[PDB]
Structure formats: C-alpha cells, structure tokens
Amino acid sequence: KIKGTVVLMPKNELNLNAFLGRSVSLQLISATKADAHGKGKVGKDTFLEGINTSLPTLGAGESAFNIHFEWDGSMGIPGAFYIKNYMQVEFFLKSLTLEATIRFVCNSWVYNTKLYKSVRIFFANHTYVPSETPAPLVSYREEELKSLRGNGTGERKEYDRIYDYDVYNDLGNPDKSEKLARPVLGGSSTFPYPRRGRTGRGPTVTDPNTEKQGEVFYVPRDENLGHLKSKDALEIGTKSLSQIVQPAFESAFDLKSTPIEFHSFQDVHDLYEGGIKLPRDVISTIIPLPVIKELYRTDGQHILKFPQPHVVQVSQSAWMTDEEFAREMIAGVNPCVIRGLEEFPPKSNLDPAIYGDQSSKITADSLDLDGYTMDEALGSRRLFMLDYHDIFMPYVRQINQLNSAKTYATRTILFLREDGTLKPVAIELSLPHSAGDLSAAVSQVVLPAKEGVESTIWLLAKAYVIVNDSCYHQLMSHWLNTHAAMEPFVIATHRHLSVLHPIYKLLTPHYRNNMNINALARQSLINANGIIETTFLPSKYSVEMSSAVYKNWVFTDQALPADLIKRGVAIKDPSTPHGVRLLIEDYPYAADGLEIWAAIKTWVQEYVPLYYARDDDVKNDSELQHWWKEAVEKGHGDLKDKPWWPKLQTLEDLVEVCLIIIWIASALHAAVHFGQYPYGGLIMNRPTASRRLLPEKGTPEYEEMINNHEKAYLRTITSKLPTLISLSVIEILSTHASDEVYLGQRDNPHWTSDSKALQAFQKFGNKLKEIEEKLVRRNNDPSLQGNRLGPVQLPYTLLYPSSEEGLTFRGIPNSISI
Ligand SMILES: [Fe+3]
C-alpha cells in the first residue's frame, strides 16, 4: 500500500468529517506502466480515510487527510492522479504527497464531479519538455491541454477552466444607452489592441458586436484567487467602489451636504488631517464593506479620513517646486516617458494640414540653461523633454468639445544641471487649429516664474502637463503596457504549455491574479462610465486612446535596455556592467531597474540551459512553438505583421522572450503601480483632469489667477467629487495584499523536483536580497539626495524587491496582481 496525504481547504476558509466516507476519491496514474494503448495504467478509486493531525507545519486554513492506495510495484511509479469530488460544495485541493517521496502541487478548485466533462487530473512535480514526457503520460498531457483550450464557443461558467481570446467589445453598455456605446478595441486596423480572456456571454440586444453585461466577468476558475483574509481581496474593491461607494458619494453632492468644490489647498489637505464630513448614511454605506472600510479612518458617524500621502509626509508644499516636478519624471509614478532631445526646436510628425503649423514656439534664447548655450546643452546631452505633443494633439479637439474637459497637447523641456538634477525650463501648451474653429484659444509657451501672476500661469502650465502625464501613465504606462499587454501571454501559456513544461513553471508565477484584476477592470475600471472615464480627462475617449498608442507598442522595446536607448536617456556601452550608460547618471527608476533587470536575466539564463541544450531543442519543442505562435498571431494578433517579433528558434530568443515577460509583469508593473497613492494621493501633485484652458486677460478668470491662485488652480484640475473617487481607487491599488508573492518567492517550495532549478531559484532570491542592500545604500547616499529623495524627501523604494503588506511604496510582486 502507498501511504498518501491530501491537503485541502474547505470552501468556507475563503466540517472535516464530510470529506470522509465516499465523498472524495483519487486514482493514481502510472508514469512508467501503460495499458494496451500506451496510456498510464489507472488504479482503483480510493477515498479519503481520515483527518491527519501530525505535522505542525500546516497553516492557511488547510487540513490534511490520510489515504492509502492499492498499488503494486508492477503498476510502475505513479506520476499523476485523477480526483472526483462527490460532495455538493467545491473544495480547494492543495496537494498530494506519496511516501516511499512523490509530490503533487495542485492548488486548484475541485467542483462536484457531475460538472466536469472529464475528470480532474493532476501531475507530479517533475518537469519535462514534450520530448521528455514519459511515454505513458504523453496522451494525458496533450488531452489536458486540449481540455484547457475549449472549442471557442459557449458561455463560460464559474467552474470552467477554459482559456481563450476575445477582443475588448465588453466595455460598452449600448443596451442601457447609446451614449454608453464604445468602439470594439482589437481586431481592426483602426483599433488594434491586445486580446483578453474570452467570457462568451453573448451579444447585446442593440449591437451584435458588443458583448452583453454580466454580473460576474468570468476568468478560468483557478485564476480567481481566493483570500484567507477578506482585507486581501483588493481586486474586489474596485467593484465595490464603483457600484456601491461612488453612488453614495454622488448623493452627498446632489443633496449639497458638502461643498461641491475645494475652495483652497487646505480643503484638500483636510482629507488626510481632520478628514471630510459626510452624511451619516453615506458613512454607513462605506464602513461595513471589506477592503473599502480599510481605506479610511472614521468616527463611525460622519468622518472619513484618508491616509497621509507619502509625498507630503515631510513637506506638504514641495510638490509645487520645479525641482520635484522634474524629479518625478525620473523617480515618480510614471518615470519612463522622458526622452533625450537632440535637436532644437523639438519637431512634430503631425500633419499641419489638419492641426495647423506644428512648429514649436519655444525660442532657445528664452531658456535658462544655467549659462549653457543651446548647442552646448544639446551636444553634452543635457537636454531632455516630456513630450505629449504628438500623442495628445489628435485627441485635443474632441476632448475639448466635452463639457467639463479642456486640455492642451503639452511638451516640457528639461535641462540636466551640472549637479545632476533635472530642471524644467519651458512648457509649450499646444492646441490644434483649423479653419472655422469656434474657439479663439491659442497655443502658448510658458516659462518658469516664482512671483506674481506669471508664477500662477507657470503652476497651471505644470498642471496641464501632469494631466497629460497622468492620463498617459494610467492608460499607457500602466494599463496598456502591463495589464493588457501581458494577458495574451497568460492565455497562451495555459493553452499550450503543460503544467509539466519548464517554461510554464518559469513563467506562471508571474501571471498570478492578472486575468482576475483585468476582468474586474473591464467590468468597473475601463468600462463605459466606469471609474477611469468618470475621473480622468479623456472621458469616453480614454480606452480608445490606449488603442491608438498600442499601434506603436513594440514587444522588444519593453526590454529595459532597449527602452532606455530608444528614449535617448542611455546609450549602448559594452564597457559597462549592464551594457548601457545612463545619460542621467542618477535616474532612480533606470538605475535601480537595471539591477533588477540583470538579476532576472541571470536567473532566466541559468534556468533555460537546464532544459534546452542547443538552439535546435527550442525549435523542436512543439508546445513552445505553438505557444509563441499563438501568443503572437492571436493574442497580440493585430500586430502579427510587425518585423520585430522574436522568432524563438534559438536559446537566445527564448531567454529574451522570457526575460521581457518577467520584467513587464514584475518590476515594470511595480514601478508604475505602487507609487499611485504615494504620489497621487495629493490631487494637486497628480491631477487626473483639467477643466478649462488658460484665461484671457481682462476676464474675471484672469483676475482670479491674480487674487486667488489656489482657487484658480482648483477650478482647473479634477473636481472634488471625482477626486474623492480617484483617491479611493488608487489607495486600494497602492496596497500590497498580505498574501502577495514577491519576486524571488514562489507559492510552493516544491514547484519542481529538479534540484538544479531549485538551486538557481535560490540564487536569484539571494541576489535580490543583495540588490535591496545596494538600493538602500543609494537612498542613504547624500550625494544622490536630489533625485532619489527630492524636496519631498521621499526615498525611492519602488524597486526594493521586498515589502510587508500595506501601502508601502516598495516591493516587487511577481506579477500584475492589482
Ligand atoms: Fe496595476
């Protein structure tokens, strides 16, 4: 008899005896002895015998069960097993351990046997490329993959484990209102877009191309992460905020129970100090909700108090400094858009026949480059820019036609001072111009000013820039480049790489909760009249703008070195450790990022060789080839015609592809995600919208700039209501769940039986700890204070590998998990 132990979690953990009797049966499958068809022999249905209470090591609401299998040596060595749950309620199977040791890491929900087309099968923790699969498991290996792919049809149900693709045609809500109709993103040259997980709810009544609404947006069952602690279900918070809290906030404003607008900057600071007083029933709607209740301190009656944002923890006014404005471009929430500027004036590739003369109005002689001439600044590579002119110009006219939205396509010129810090030297606020324009508003250039109305105009100019930046950051740097771009690879991986596959094991930890947060996002974050549309500048144009940007998305340019080189902030240099020399030496995001990038590169470079000896071995891996082909031709199908896609016929290519995927999912996402509330928790520092253009002299609006600059600023940026909603969502997002799995960690120490792979993973983890010590030394280095801390005195810790739970401003999760 083979002694076995089954560890599982009853549904109520997210009694024992109910699992005994004939409730749960398992059948071992042989990996060495096959029947007359080459398929591993199957043992007899074996039921759980009893509750085991021996080894202390057994937490997380887990329970262990004893079981003995009738298995003779003549049946070979078990390498897999079937399991059938005869109970009505599903349970979470953690693992099976056979002694005499064979391990099975399952971590999967097992629903009642009648709901499955085929019996749930689980494999032992061994790792095999297709050609190494023991012959008696080959068919079982391919059948499970076929099962995971489904047939492309049907409405997906909660227990389904079917991975497939579909376009973003589920954001609009045309059946509710024509105003909620949205273009389908993906599948057209007009709107290319990464694919998302297929749900199959069917067409809406008014539009066959739009998927009907659903109360629950399906994701393959095991992608929907349960949490032992409800406070850790952060992804569900977006839904509660949109469906329950937002309406409650709106009622307080409709009933005029709180001023509609912030009237001074102190009104904004009050949010995290004394707080904001709201109607009793409004507080009562919020205080009992899981996750939402953790967002604010309350007296339980009328007060909501937000946590003090990191950016104001030392100086509440430092965000207003030109120093901090520029520093956040290299160490802020969106540190990856700035580019080197090698010619002057900056040029535009936009059609002047459509937008009017696109020549920059910025004159070189007007800039203060600390004594440098323009030619000297250009040649010494000290000139940079945050360029949103070409990106935004195509949408300015339509955004500005909206009732409470007015923006400019902005461009900010930055000069790298001799002390190594960046200083903003001009901002161009551009507007498109065409015959027949009703508006008399014109483009203009604003220069730094510390006194008088000019200083107010310059402060407002910075605000229009950050509105451009916040939109680009949330929709492109964050949503498009991490969340959306990664989902196609998650789907392809489960569809074509067996759980036995080395690359599946290498990549899957980096997909944890990605499909889940994405599905919840399609439902409440990026949907018509969703959180983003109702809080950010572009309104109903928000998501389609990210499709326009995706036209220029390049997989290989996501690699950190390539990105730095492409943006002109670094140059290739073999004589350096990372192969690139930064043009801004103390560029926190880039410098810390290169360290993390290198650690991941080493790990992948050490792992791949363990399973692929030569290039031919990669070319001959059928699953790997089918995986990559599908990821590209279907997942990111609208760009399948591009030349830059790696071919994946070499070890080099496999390493590159895995390295980039891991980078995007871990460090890239953490860097653009966990600083949201730390930096944006003060709406003045990261405005999400602008509501009017600069005022004409001789108007009351112009007089206001002179007499009440704070009010002029507040009337221009995001209004108080959407601010409250936006602060709440980014507070939720910036929080690390206590059950997060960070880079250098895995959810199970037995994910593979291969000791060599396990040793390499341990080295990767040690290297990350080593890197963290180095980053701590950088933050403590006084010579780097200007860019790593700034006048806000906020140490750049976003790329520190580790973190405790909470809103910590540090820690790199393995995946896009929130
Ligand atoms: Fe995110």
UniProtKB/Swiss-Prot annotation:
Cellular component GO terms held in the UniProt record: cytoplasm
Cofactor: Fe cation
Induction: The hydroperoxide product serves to activate the resting enzyme. The activation is accompanied by the oxidation of Fe(2+)entadiene structure.
InterPro entries membership: LipOase, LipOase_C, LipOase_C_sf, LipOase_CS, LipOase_Fe_BS, LipOase_plant, Lipoxy_PLAT/LH2, Lipoxygenase_dom_3
Residues involved in Fe cation binding: 478, 483, 669, 673, 818
One of the protein's GO biological processes: lipid oxidation
Enzyme Commission number: 1.13.11.12
GO molecular function annotation: iron ion binding; linoleate 13S-lipoxygenase activity; linolenate 9R-lipoxygenase activity; oxidoreductase activity, acting on single donors with incorporation of molecular oxygen, incorporation of two atoms of oxygen
Cofactor note: Binds 1 Fe cation per subunit. Iron is tightly bound.
Keywords carried by this UniProt record: Cytoplasm, Dioxygenase, Fatty acid biosynthesis, Fatty acid metabolism, Iron, Lipid biosynthesis, Lipid metabolism, Metal-binding, Oxidoreductase, Oxylipin biosynthesis
All copies of domain PLAT, residue ranges: 10-124
Superkingdom of the source species: Eukaryota
UniProt-reported outcome of changing residue 521 to S: Little effect on reaction profile
Documented effect of changing residue 676 to N/E: Reduces catalytic activity
Protein's pathway: Lipid metabolism; oxylipin biosynthesis
Occurrences of domain Lipoxygenase (ranges): 127-818
Catalysed reaction equations from the record: (9Z,12Z)-octadecadienoate + O2 = (13S)-hydroperoxy-(9Z,11E)-octadecadienoate; (9Z,12Z,15Z)-octadecatrienoate + O2 = (13S)-hydroperoxy-(9Z,11E,15Z)-octadecatrienoate; (4Z,7Z,10Z,13Z,16Z,19Z)-docosahexaenoate + O2 = (17S)-hydroperoxy-(4Z,7Z,10Z,13Z,15E,19Z)-docosahexaenoate; (4Z,7Z,10Z,13Z,16Z)-docosapentaenoate + O2 = (17S)-hydroperoxy-(4Z,7Z,10Z,13Z,15E)-docosapentaenoate
pH dependence: Inactive below pH 6.0.
Pfam families: Lipoxygenase, PLAT
Subunit structure and binding partners: Monomer.
Record family assignment: Belongs to the lipoxygenase family.
Name of the protein in question: Seed linoleate 13S-lipoxygenase-1
Naturally occurring in which organism (per UniProt): Glycine max
